[PDB]
A paper describes a structure:
Nuclear-encoded pentatricopeptide repeat (PPR) proteins with a C-terminal DYW domain have been characterized as site-specific factors for C-to-U RNA editing in plant mitochondria and plastids. Here we report crystal structures of the DYW domain of an Arabidopsis thaliana (A. thaliana) plastid RNA editing factor, OTP86, as the outcome of a solubility and crystallization screening of over 100 different DYW domain constructs from 30 PPR proteins. OTP86 was characterized as a site-specific factor for an editing site in rps14 transcripts.
Finally, we obtained crystals of OTP86DYW with space group P21212, which diffracted to a resolution of 1.65 Å. The conformational change mainly involved the β-hairpin of the gating domain (which now adopts an extended β-strand conformation), and its connection to α-helix 1 (gating domain) and α-helix 2 (deaminase domain). The restructuring of the active site reduces the zinc-water/water-E894 distances from 3.07 Å/3.93 Å (inactive conformation) to 2.15 Å/2.53 Å, thereby activating the mechanistically important water molecule. In OTP86DYW★, distances and angles of the zinc ligands are in agreement with a catalytically competent reaction centre. Furthermore, the strand length of the β-finger is extended upon activation, still maintaining the original backbone hydrogen bonding residue pairs of the inactive OTP86DYW.
Numbering used by the authors:
A (entry chain A), B (entry chain G): 825 to 960
């Protein structure tokens, strides 16, 4: 589905969008919010959060959309792999524009290359720029 | 790119994601709202509206995400092509799960087959079901 995998010197962990029925370790979500804040503070990142509303009965309801799984995978990688180590992410869907931008900025600020294989392309993020040239 | 095209007996119209600087005819958006409300009336279709929030200093700001271009294309087709005519749509991205369901329901409730060629696959929607078997 919307799955991402991180591969760390042969070792593999899978991540999905937020599922409160199967929560990841809170330490990982804490790292994500910490990285998001540092991106906002240190490189002027405009952090996105998405939500929807459904036309239910007796009024209306809003529902926060869960951030995409590769951001969780990247936070896990920043927690578990050495400083400056390349982060290798595999996705089964095409990386969206907002996640692609997130990856660029992470590669710059945390001084780690990111190699992402999404549905269609290898994206190599180095120092804030991607090998795809932002066409994918 | 968020573009869709409709092809009607060789004639071709392109649709982009909603742009207030370049908006299409009012009749098209009215038809789409009529379709969406008919879906709710007949099958109870959960019509969602998506939003993004970006937190900025001057004013923390919410932006509405605009519906995807193929629903506009389908509304245009329902307006401008004869009853029961097949609707042929081309998209340069993968159709999302919500739009794929929308197409399935339109094919049933408006008695039109839809042939959609997205980024990777031909989807042939007939009577509520797709040739991809909902794996794409
Ligand atoms: Zn994304
Ligand atoms: Zn790229
Ligand atoms: Zn869609
Ligand atoms: Zn299909």
């Amino acid at each position: 589905m919307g799955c991402s995998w991180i591969e760390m010197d042969g070792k593999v962990h899978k991540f999905t969008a937020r599922d409160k029925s199967h929560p990841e370790s809170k330490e990982i979500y804490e790292k994500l919010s910490e990285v998001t804040r540092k991106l906002e503070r240190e490189v002027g990142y405009v952090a996105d959060t998405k939500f929807v509303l459904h036309n239910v009965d007796e009024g209306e309801k809003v529902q926060m959309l869960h951030g995409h799984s590769e951001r969780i995978a990247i936070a896990y990688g920043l927690l578990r792999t050495p400083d400056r180590a390349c982060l290798r992410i595999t996705k089964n869907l095409r990386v969206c524009r907002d996640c692609h931008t997130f990856c660029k900025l992470v590669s710059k600020l945390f001084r780690r290359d990111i190699v992402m294989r999404d549905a269609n392309r290898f994206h190599h993020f180095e120092s804030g720029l991607c090998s795809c040239g932002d066409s994918w």
